[PDB]
Design an enzyme around this catalytic site. Structure first.
Site, PDB file in Angstrom:
ATOM      1  N   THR A 149       2.605  10.741 -13.836  1.00 18.21           N
ATOM      2  CA  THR A 149       2.322   9.485 -14.527  1.00 18.21           C
ATOM      3  C   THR A 149       3.576   8.707 -14.905  1.00 18.21           C
ATOM      4  OG1 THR A 149       2.150  10.729 -16.591  1.00 18.21           O
ATOM      5  CG2 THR A 149       0.095  10.191 -15.440  1.00 18.21           C
ATOM      6  N   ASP A 159       2.616   7.192  16.489  1.00 16.98           N
ATOM      7  CA  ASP A 159       4.010   6.825  16.263  1.00 16.98           C
ATOM      8  C   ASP A 159       4.845   7.165  17.497  1.00 16.98           C
ATOM      9  OD1 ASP A 159       5.316   6.270  13.183  1.00 16.98           O
ATOM     10  OD2 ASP A 159       6.723   6.749  14.806  1.00 16.98           O
ATOM     11  N   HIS A 190      11.504   8.766  14.165  1.00 20.87           N
ATOM     12  CA  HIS A 190      10.629   8.074  13.217  1.00 20.87           C
ATOM     13  C   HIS A 190       9.294   8.799  13.038  1.00 20.87           C
ATOM     14  CE1 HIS A 190       7.861   4.693  12.069  1.00 20.87           C
ATOM     15  NE2 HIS A 190       8.896   4.274  11.365  1.00 20.87           N
ATOM     16  N   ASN A 235       7.778  -4.767   6.644  1.00 17.43           N
ATOM     17  CA  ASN A 235       9.093  -4.697   6.007  1.00 17.43           C
ATOM     18  C   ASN A 235       9.818  -6.038   5.971  1.00 17.43           C
ATOM     19  OD1 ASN A 235       8.701  -1.868   5.823  1.00 17.43           O
ATOM     20  ND2 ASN A 235       9.596  -1.591   7.858  1.00 17.43           N
ATOM     21  N   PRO A 276      -8.789  -5.833   6.799  1.00 16.49           N
ATOM     22  CA  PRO A 276      -9.238  -5.498   5.440  1.00 16.49           C
ATOM     23  C   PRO A 276      -9.839  -4.110   5.292  1.00 16.49           C
ATOM     24  CG  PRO A 276      -9.913  -7.723   6.049  1.00 16.49           C
ATOM     25  CD  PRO A 276      -9.428  -7.062   7.307  1.00 16.49           C
ATOM     26  N   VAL A 297      -9.059  -1.166   6.496  1.00 15.79           N
ATOM     27  CA  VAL A 297      -8.189   0.009   6.453  1.00 15.79           C
ATOM     28  C   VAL A 297      -7.405   0.006   5.143  1.00 15.79           C
ATOM     29  CG1 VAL A 297      -8.145   0.114   8.964  1.00 15.79           C
ATOM     30  CG2 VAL A 297      -6.292  -1.056   7.718  1.00 15.79           C
ATOM     31  N   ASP A 307      -3.637  -2.483  -0.473  1.00 19.87           N
ATOM     32  CA  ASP A 307      -4.520  -1.641  -1.266  1.00 19.87           C
ATOM     33  C   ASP A 307      -3.786  -0.771  -2.265  1.00 19.87           C
ATOM     34  OD1 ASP A 307      -7.330  -1.975  -0.011  1.00 19.87           O
ATOM     35  OD2 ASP A 307      -6.027  -1.650   1.731  1.00 19.87           O
ATOM     36  N   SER A 356       6.940   2.332   6.480  1.00 16.59           N
ATOM     37  CA  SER A 356       6.630   3.482   7.323  1.00 16.59           C
ATOM     38  C   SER A 356       6.673   4.789   6.566  1.00 16.59           C
ATOM     39  CB  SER A 356       7.607   3.595   8.490  1.00 16.59           C
ATOM     40  OG  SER A 356       7.419   2.575   9.450  1.00 16.59           O
ATOM     41  N   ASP A 368       2.476  -0.078 -13.364  1.00 15.22           N
ATOM     42  CA  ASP A 368       3.757   0.570 -13.598  1.00 15.22           C
ATOM     43  C   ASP A 368       4.881   0.043 -12.715  1.00 15.22           C
ATOM     44  OD1 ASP A 368       1.853   3.541 -14.186  1.00 15.22           O
ATOM     45  OD2 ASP A 368       2.753   2.218 -15.676  1.00 15.22           O
TER      46      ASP A 368
HETATM   47  C1  LIG Z   1      10.987   3.063  14.983  1.00 15.25           C
HETATM   48  C2  LIG Z   1      10.042   2.532  13.880  1.00 15.25           C
HETATM   49  C3  LIG Z   1       8.654   2.143  14.443  1.00 15.25           C
HETATM   50  C4  LIG Z   1       7.786   1.328  13.469  1.00 15.25           C
HETATM   51  C5  LIG Z   1       8.676   0.160  13.022  1.00 15.25           C
HETATM   52  N1  LIG Z   1       8.072  -1.108  12.537  1.00 15.25           N
HETATM   53  C6  LIG Z   1       7.073  -1.520  11.545  1.00 15.25           C
HETATM   54  O1  LIG Z   1       6.474  -0.775  10.837  1.00 15.25           O
HETATM   55  C7  LIG Z   1       6.901  -3.049  11.492  1.00 15.25           C
HETATM   56  N2  LIG Z   1       5.690  -3.707  11.002  1.00 15.25           N
HETATM   57  C8  LIG Z   1       4.727  -3.248  10.229  1.00 15.25           C
HETATM   58  C9  LIG Z   1       3.819  -4.255  10.035  1.00 15.25           C
HETATM   59  N3  LIG Z   1       4.242  -5.313  10.690  1.00 15.25           N
HETATM   60  C10 LIG Z   1       5.399  -4.988  11.284  1.00 15.25           C
HETATM   61  C11 LIG Z   1       9.810   0.671  12.126  1.00 15.25           C
HETATM   62  C12 LIG Z   1      10.760   1.470  13.019  1.00 15.25           C
END
Ligand SMILES: C[C@H]1CC[C@H](NC(=O)Cn2ccnc2)CC1
Ligand SMILES: C[C@H]1CC[C@H](NC(=O)Cn2ccnc2)CC1
Length: 279
Positions: free
Chosen positions: A16, A39, A69, A161, A175, A177, A200, A224, A260
């Site tokens: 908290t 990813d 990543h 970002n 919306p 997700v 959210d 990310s 917060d």
């Molecule tokens: C190699 C990685 C892969 C994912 C990358 N890009 C993002 O998340 C950018 N984003 C998110 C929402 N709109 C644009 C960060 C680097």
């Protein structure tokens, strides 16, 4: 259970208040749940994954994470030391190449893959997907994320970002997700975090220590990094029976720490993911 000297983000999601360093969580730890990390891949051989990670799909010549990543995000979901849900099963779907790039058509295919592939996996406590990626607005990308959610998968997506309104990014702007912004260890919105009414929830996203390729670890920042905190939290809560894939985003918002964070633009939720764990 208590993990001392944990990464600050794990401590934050079980607290908290900012400024503590122990992560507290029920020992069930997401057992029986599954999280897909969509990813650059996952280095499943990393000791931190303990055999609980596996690559299930790639769209490139290899399933190896040549970037790091995806391995970092997977580590925040479910690695033994750096993860929220330390007993979840992790599934890697490589939609991004080793430079971190991917076409929207590939990303859409990866989302539809998860919606089907979960029927090939044993996930009695439920299924989550973590999407630490995005680009400009696309109705097709948003529709794919909505389909994945509708299929019975808790979809957590990075807000982006650009210190901008996430309504102009996808899949952030879908919306249905769970769209995740980033905070820092002093409870400030991360400088780069997107914002807006579509968000959210916030999770830890600045200076997040996790797994990396080559059996290593490092600290990096981004929405990310916030997204897998929320994905791992969802898996943890689903294993406890407190929520379901369809309801987990609302449950996390309902149970979040409220009011917060600082530098939250007017109209953006002031909600920070919190596991409500009491020993
Ligand atoms: C190699 C990685 C892969 C994912 C990358 N890009 C993002 O998340 C950018 N984003 C998110 C929402 N709109 C644009 C960060 C680097
Ligand atoms: C490494 C630091 C350890 C101390 C932490 N204490 C706080 O956040 C509490 N705080 C904020 C402003 N004034 C007091 C923050 C991180």
């Amino acid at each position: 259970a208590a993990q001392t000297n944990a990464p600050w983000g794990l401590a934050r999601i079980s607290s908290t208040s900012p400024g503590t360093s122990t992560y507290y969580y029920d020992e069930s730890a997401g057992q029986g749940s599954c999280v897909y990390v969509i990813d650059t891949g996952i280095e499943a051989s990393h000791p931190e994954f303990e055999g609980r990670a596996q690559m299930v799909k790639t769209y490139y010549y290899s399933s190896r994470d040549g970037n790091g990543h995806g391995t970092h995000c997977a580590g925040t979901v479910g690695s033994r030391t750096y993860g929220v849900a330390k007993k979840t099963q992790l599934f890697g779907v490589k939609v991004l190449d080793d430079n971190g790039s991917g076409q929207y058509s590939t990303i859409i295919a990866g989302m539809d893959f998860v919606a089907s592939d979960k029927n090939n996996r044993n996930c009695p406590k439920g299924v989550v997907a973590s999407l630490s990626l995005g680009g400009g607005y696309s109705s097709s990308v948003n529709s794919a994320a909505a389909r994945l959610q509708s299929s019975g998968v808790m979809v957590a997506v990075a807000a982006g970002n650009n210190n901008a309104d996430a309504r102009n990014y996808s899949p952030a702007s879908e919306p249905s997700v769970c769209t995740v912004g980033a905070s820092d260890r002093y409870d400030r919105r991360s400088s780069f975090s997107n914002y807006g009414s579509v968000l959210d929830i916030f999770g830890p996203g600045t200076d997040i220590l996790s797994t990396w390729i080559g059996g290593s670890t490092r600290s990096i920042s981004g929405t990310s990094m916030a997204t897998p905190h929320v994905a791992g939290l969802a898996a943890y809560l689903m294993t406890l029976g407190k929520t379901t894939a369809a309801s987990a985003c609302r449950y996390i918002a309902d149970t979040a720490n409220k009011g917060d964070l600082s530098n939250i633009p007017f109209g953006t939720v002031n909600l920070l993911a919190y596991n409500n764990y009491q020993a």
